[PDB]
Amino acid sequence: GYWITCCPTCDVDINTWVPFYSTELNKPAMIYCSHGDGHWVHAQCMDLEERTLIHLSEGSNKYYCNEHVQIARA
């Protein structure tokens, strides 16, 4: 599930990917979008700064991708 095309503008490609965040080496960091049943997206494709990403990973707050974040939630 690491080499999926996470969104319309996804920049991660198994043929070109390289580490960006300090926590990455051979695979792209990813975060789950809680919209509906939910789905995984690449953190970098969401323009998330490393500290924001790490904070999200260290808490229980849900994340919503740039495509679903404005959708009225419930």
Partner: peptide, 12 residues
Amino acid sequence: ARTKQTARKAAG
């Protein structure tokens, strides 16, 4: 939020 590859690698 659930994440992947957000763990700090050892060598410190």
